Amino acid sequence: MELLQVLKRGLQQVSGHGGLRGYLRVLFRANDVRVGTLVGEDKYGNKYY
Amino acid sequence: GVRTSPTGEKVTHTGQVYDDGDYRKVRFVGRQKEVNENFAIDLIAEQPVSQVGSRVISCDGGGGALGHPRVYINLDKETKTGTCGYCGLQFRQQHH
Amino acid sequence: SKVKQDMPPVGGYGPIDYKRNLPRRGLSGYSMFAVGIGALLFGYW
Amino acid sequence: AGLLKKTTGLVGLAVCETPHERLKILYTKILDVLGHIPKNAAYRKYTEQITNEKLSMVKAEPDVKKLEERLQGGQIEEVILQAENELSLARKMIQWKPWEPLVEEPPASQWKWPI
Amino acid sequence: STSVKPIFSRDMNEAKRRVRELYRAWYREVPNTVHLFQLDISVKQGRDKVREMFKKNAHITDPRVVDLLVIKGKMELEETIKVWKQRTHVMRFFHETEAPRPKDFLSKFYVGHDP
Amino acid sequence: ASATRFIQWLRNWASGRDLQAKLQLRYQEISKRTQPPPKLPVGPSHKLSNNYYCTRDGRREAMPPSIVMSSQEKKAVSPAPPIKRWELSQDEPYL
Amino acid sequence: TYKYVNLREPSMDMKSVTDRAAQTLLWTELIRGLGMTLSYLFREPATINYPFEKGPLSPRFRGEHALRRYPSGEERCIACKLCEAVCPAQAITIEAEPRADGSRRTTRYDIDMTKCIYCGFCQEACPVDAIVEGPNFEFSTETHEELLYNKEKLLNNGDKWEAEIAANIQADYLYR
Amino acid sequence: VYDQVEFDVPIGSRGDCYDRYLCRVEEMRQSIRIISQCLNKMPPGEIKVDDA
Amino acid sequence: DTRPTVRPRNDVAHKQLSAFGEYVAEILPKYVQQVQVSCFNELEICIHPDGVIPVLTFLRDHSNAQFKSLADLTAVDIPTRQNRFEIVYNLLSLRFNSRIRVKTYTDELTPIESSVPVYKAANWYEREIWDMFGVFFANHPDLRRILTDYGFEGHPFRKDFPLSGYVELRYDDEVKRVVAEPVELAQEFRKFDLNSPWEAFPAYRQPPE
Amino acid sequence: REKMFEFYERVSGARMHAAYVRPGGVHQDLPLGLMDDIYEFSKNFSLRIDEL
Numbered sequence A: 001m002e003l004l005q006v007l008k009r010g011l012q013q014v015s016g017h018g019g020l021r022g023y024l025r026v027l028f029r030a031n032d033v034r035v036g037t038l039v040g041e042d043k044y045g046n047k048y049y
Numbered sequence B: 001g002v003r004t005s006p007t008g009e010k011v012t013h014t015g016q017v018y019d020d021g022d023y024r025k026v027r028f029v030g031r032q033k034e035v036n037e038n039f040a041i042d043l044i045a046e047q048p049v050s051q052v053g054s055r056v057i058s059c060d061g062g063g064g065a066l067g068h069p070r071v072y073i074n075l076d077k078e079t080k081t082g083t084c085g086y087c088g089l090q091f092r093q094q095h096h
Numbered sequence C: 001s002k003v004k005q006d007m008p009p010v011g012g013y014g015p016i017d018y019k020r021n022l023p024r025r026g027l028s029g030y031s032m033f034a035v036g037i038g039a040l041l042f043g044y045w
Numbered sequence D: 001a002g003l004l005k006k007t008t009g010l011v012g013l014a015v016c017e018t019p020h021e022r023l024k025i026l027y028t029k030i031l032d033v034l035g036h037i038p039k040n041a042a043y044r045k046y047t048e049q050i051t052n053e054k055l056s057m058v059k060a061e062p063d064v065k066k067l068e069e070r071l072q073g074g075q076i077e078e079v080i081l082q083a084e085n086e087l088s089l090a091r092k093m094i095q096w097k098p099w100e101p102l103v104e105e106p107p108a109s110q111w112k113w114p115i
Numbered sequence E: 001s002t003s004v005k006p007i008f009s010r011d012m013n014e015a016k017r018r019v020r021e022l023y024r025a026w027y028r029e030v031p032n033t034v035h036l037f038q039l040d041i042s043v044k045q046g047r048d049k050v051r052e053m054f055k056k057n058a059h060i061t062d063p064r065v066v067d068l069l070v071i072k073g074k075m076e077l078e079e080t081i082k083v084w085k086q087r088t089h090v091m092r093f094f095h096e097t098e099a100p101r102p103k104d105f106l107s108k109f110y111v112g113h114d115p
Numbered sequence F: 001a002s003a004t005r006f007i008q009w010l011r012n013w014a015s016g017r018d019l020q021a022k023l024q025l026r027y028q029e030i031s032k033r034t035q036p037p038p039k040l041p042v043g044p045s046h047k048l049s050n051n052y053y054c055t056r057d058g059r060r061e062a063m064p065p066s067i068v069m070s071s072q073e074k075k076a077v078s079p080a081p082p083i084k085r086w087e088l089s090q091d092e093p094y095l
Numbered sequence G: 001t002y003k004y005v006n007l008r009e010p011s012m013d014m015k016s017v018t019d020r021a022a023q024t025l026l027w028t029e030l031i032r033g034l035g036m037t038l039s040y041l042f043r044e045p046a047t048i049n050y051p052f053e054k055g056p057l058s059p060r061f062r063g064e065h066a067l068r069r070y071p072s073g074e075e076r077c078i079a080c081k082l083c084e085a086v087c088p089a090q091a092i093t094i095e096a097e098p099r100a101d102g103s104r105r106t107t108r109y110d111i112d113m114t115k116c117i118y119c120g121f122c123q124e125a126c127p128v129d130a131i132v133e134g135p136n137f138e139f140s141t142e143t144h145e146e147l148l149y150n151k152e153k154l155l156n157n158g159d160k161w162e163a164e165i166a167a168n169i170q171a172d173y174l175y176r
Numbered sequence H: 001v002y003d004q005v006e007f008d009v010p011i012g013s014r015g016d017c018y019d020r021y022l023c024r025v026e027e028m029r030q031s032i033r034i035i036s037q038c039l040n041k042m043p044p045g046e047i048k049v050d051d052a
Numbered sequence I: 001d002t003r004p005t006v007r008p009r010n011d012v013a014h015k016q017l018s019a020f021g022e023y024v025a026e027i028l029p030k031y032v033q034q035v036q037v038s039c040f041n042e043l044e045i046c047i048h049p050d051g052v053i054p055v056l057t058f059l060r061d062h063s064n065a066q067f068k069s070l071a072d073l074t075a076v077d078i079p080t081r082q083n084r085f086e087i088v089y090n091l092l093s094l095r096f097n098s099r100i101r102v103k104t105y106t107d108e109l110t111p112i113e114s115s116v117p118v119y120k121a122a123n124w125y126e127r128e129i130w131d132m133f134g135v136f137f138a139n140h141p142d143l144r145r146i147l148t149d150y151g152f153e154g155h156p157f158r159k160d161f162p163l164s165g166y167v168e169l170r171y172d173d174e175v176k177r178v179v180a181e182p183v184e185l186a187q188e189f190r191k192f193d194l195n196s197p198w199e200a201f202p203a204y205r206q207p208p209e
Numbered sequence J: 001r002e003k004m005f006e007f008y009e010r011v012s013g014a015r016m017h018a019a020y021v022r023p024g025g026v027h028q029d030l031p032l033g034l035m036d037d038i039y040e041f042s043k044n045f046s047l048r049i050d051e052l
């Protein structure tokens, strides 16, 4: 039962990054696929979570 | 402000520039001479003179302990404006 | 205003453990040997 | 005495089965060596004074653990080793002869500080 | 006042014995040093350099100073023989990189202010 | 903290200790990184009276070394009283 | 007080002797160590995803040097040369002359960052909060010459990092 | 203020690398013991001698 | 001892250490030249350099001393003195929880007797003194440089040795090895004159000449 | 060890060479909240030793 919840959290990450294309972008650019709250954005384009 | 020499090199706020025949300007070939564009001599002059009603005024530079050591400036000469030796701010005594 | 300094909580911090704690574990020596002897006999059979 | 110690606690130091006898032998040896030293020498007058103190305590107290407390030299094996060291020092003093006057006074400002 | 503790030699004749003995050891050791360190100099060049170092100090007449120079030499022998040194250390005696420095008044005058 | 209940049991059983009580990764129990401004105390010499420096000048109370002897029936003595034997700890004498 | 770290004698009853024999033959204690490494395998790693995640720092952090300004834009430095005198590494070089307006200001302010030990003595000594060790630690260079800082470099760093520098001072100036 | 904190000194018996390992590891435990006391008995006041 | 900022005084130690100094001087008149105890309670014995082994052995082995540990052995260069080198022995007595400093002197050419027979710790300390100051310890097991580079000529810790030395190293591609050359510094070390012209400590005022 | 460098860095601004202890005391007072974090480190350190 716990395993099923864990797997849902692993798919919600894919949707939380905008889909597979967004999920893969961060995976290869950042090597991490966590989803976090957006604290803000700066004038150069960097996003802070 | 940054003024450029006949060679094209930027002059610093200390008046430093390499004359035409100096070999040391080769270090800037393919790179840059870093010069701060904010000349402190020009920016302090922009600050308005403060009109005060006493022969003596104190200056700490602002911020209290985040400024400079507190000094007292005499304003009894009317041919000049009292200036701080630390922050460069000017003061004048307002005719009573 | 009053002095504010990094100081201990009024009641003091909770107890802090420092002694060794290697918990005792496992089965008796007799029991471990018997199981091994038992597995052999079943396998031999 | 009592039950023999299993260990002194110090590595390289062995328990002595006959502590009182060994101490009496060594302290008496020291006094014999001190006899050859000139009488007025302060090494003789001081070394005799402390050694004869220690010798008296051994003879007075049979128990080892009580003797250790009174001698204030640690374990009895630590005390015995110290006796051997004093005996070795005594024999060396006879050749050095440090009771003789100063060989040479230092230069004028050798020990002046600040310069 | 002039009475001073010696180091080893009590007179220059006894000291000059140690200088010669030291030269013997160095002279035997250059052939092995060139072979072991794989230097690109000749044995004659190394033996010439040993002679030069021994010649530099050819003016001293104090037995104690000569003893110290012999002591320092013998230390350098233990280093070189035991290969504590390296090729860079052995070749520092020859000052290969240092371009020749002028040693006449006019040449010194043209280059700088030094005497 | 994010470990599933099964994994907590597995690593607790293998180690043998309740690892979730004393985790080695800091979470929310740390202090805030922005703290209220301090107001620090002042020293004993922040006084407006009876505070002359000549009465609290340690450097000037230092004296040159005493010269016990110079070339220029007593009882024997020791550099200090013989040291006291240590006592075994009563918290845990033997490890 | 003292305690003995290894002065315990074993029990010679058969149950104890047998238990030790099992430990010797069945490698119980060695198996125990394998469990700890197994427990760590199922723990969350302590690694951070640098450069996307950074290690925590404090306002007191001593990093890249900067020269500051008053709010007017005037340089705080008055060429007192206290930083030059206290620098344990002799990393600071200063030359001063009267400015065209009569102010005591520097013509040279050079810090050799390959001589600096990043001790912060020069920001303690400064009476006007002009020279500061800033927050930055990511200024590695491809050449040595790029680490010999002059006045213009240090002023640009101040104008570059002023917003962070001022806020950190606001946090720690009451401890200083 | 090491005379106002209580701690035990580990002592070896065999003089070997194993005993020295045990002394150092036990010294770590005693330091935690000292740290607990320093945390709770930290006094208020100034931090550098008030002699400028 | 209610002055917050002033170091407390311990007279019990001063009386104890002073008496022990009289004890040593009485027992070893042949070598002891001076005994002094400081304001912060440390005893110093100053001896002729020919009593190093006798004095150290007595302190190590005497039952009213037992200074079994040689904490440190070092030297100090004082050029103005005709015997410029001051050899200092610092000893620890675990039995009596006490420390004593023993001082002697030598010059560039006069050897001191090695203390290795008394303390085996002195082997390396004496090597360091030779390497750094150039003092020769006679009858040493192996006296050789310990801290300086192989072939280094000079004794760096003498007050007359320049701080940056006389030679510096670099790698030369022509000879494909590290070479030594005379030292040239891009930035010369800046000598700051910090001493104040006004006396600070009257109690140490030296008598006028 | 990394967490203990954070205690050096918070008092002095350097993870290793703090230059914090100076003749007469220390350079700066403990920042507020430091001792609470030292207690947390100490509370969970004995376990790390046991694992060792």
Ligand SMILES: CCCCCCCCCCCCCCCCCC(=O)OC[C@H](COP(=O)([O-])OCC[N+](C)(C)C)OC(=O)CCCCCCCCCCCCCCCCC
Binding pocket: C037, C040, C041, G024, G025, G026, G027, G030, G031
């Ligand atoms: C029942 C009918 C009759 C038949 C009876 C048959 C006999 C049955 C009883 C025999 C008992 C035999 C016990 C096993 C063998 C003992 C080995 C031994 O000698 O140990 C002593 C040795 C020595 O221990 P020691 O510390 O005592 O060494 C000193 C020895 N003295 C004191 C005696 C001088 O122990 C070791 O072997 C240590 C090995 C270190 C490497 C371990 C690596 C980790 C391995 C962990 C995983 C192990 C599981 C692997 C499983 C593989 C699966 C495919």
Ligand code: SF4
Binding pocket: G083, G086, G087, G088, G089, G090, G091, G092, G111, G115, G116, G117, G118, G119, G120, G121, G122, G123, G133
């Ligand atoms: S941080 Fe220290 S070493 Fe670096 S420039 Fe400032 S005073 Fe000098």
Ligand code: SF4
Binding pocket: G076, G077, G078, G079, G080, G081, G082, G083, G084, G094, G122, G125, G126, G127, G128, G129, G130, G131
């Ligand atoms: S201490 Fe401050 S004001 Fe003085 S010279 Fe240095 S940077 Fe300028």
Ligand SMILES: [Zn+2]
Binding pocket: B059, B060, B061, B068, B084, B085, B086, B087, B088, B089
């Ligand atoms: Zn001002």
